[PDB]
């Protein structure tokens, strides 16, 4: 997988509903998880998330939505376009507008990241 949308990732801001269905995905997502924003949009964020970790992912969304605004931080394995468990940290918090009723989740790549276009 060698796209040419952006330079390198770090974290991509993807909005979604409580379910995790991406109501928005920042174009960094292609450099981050290979999946273009549209390749994520309408998709359940956790569907990519490792099963055993989806419970934690959804949990976060359940907390941000419960506390309406309060940000959540959860690390999960995002099966990216490379078909690899991309460990990420989510910054889930009720989106701004008009997706206020949604949840702005900033998926940031973990592990070592300096001059690598992956993670």
Curated annotation (Swiss-Prot):
Monomer. Homodimer only upon binding to a DNA. Efficient DNA binding requires dimerization with another bHLH protein. Interacts with TACC3. Interacts with HIF1A, EPAS1, NPAS1 and NPAS3; forms a heterodimer that binds core DNA sequence 5'-TACGTG-3' within the hypoxia response element (HRE) of target gene promoters. Forms a heterodimer with AHRR, as well as with other bHLH proteins. Interacts with NOCA7. Interacts with TACC3. Residues 73-116 form the PAC domain. It is found in: Nucleus. It comes from the Eukaryota. This is Aryl hydrocarbon receptor nuclear translocator. Required for activity of the AHR. Upon ligand binding, AHR translocates into the nucleus, where it heterodimerizes with ARNT and induces transcription by binding to xenobiotic response elements (XRE). Not required for the ligand-binding subunit to translocate from the cytosol to the nucleus after ligand binding. The complex initiates transcription of genes involved in the regulation of a variety of biological processes, including angiogenesis, hematopoiesis, drug and lipid metabolism, cell motility and immune modulation. Residues 5-68 form the PAS domain. The chain holds residues 356 to 470 of 789 of the full protein. Disulfide bonds: none annotated. Signal peptide: none annotated.
């Amino acid at each position: 997988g060698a796209m040419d949308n952006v330079c390198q990732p770090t974290e991509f801001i993807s909005r979604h509903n409580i379910e995790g269905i991406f109501t928005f995905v920042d174009h960094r997502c292609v450099a981050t998880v290979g999946y273009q924003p549209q390749e994520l949009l309408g998709k359940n964020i956790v569907e990519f998330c490792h099963p055993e970790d989806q419970q934690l992912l959804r949990d976060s969304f359940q907390q941000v939505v419960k506390l309406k605004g309060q940000v959540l931080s959860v690390m999960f394995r995002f099966r990216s376009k490379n078909q690899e468990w991309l460990w990420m940290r989510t910054s889930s918090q009720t989106a701004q507008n008009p997706y206020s009723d949604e949840i702005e989740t900033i998926i940031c790549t973990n592990t070592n990241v300096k001059n690598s276009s992956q993670e």
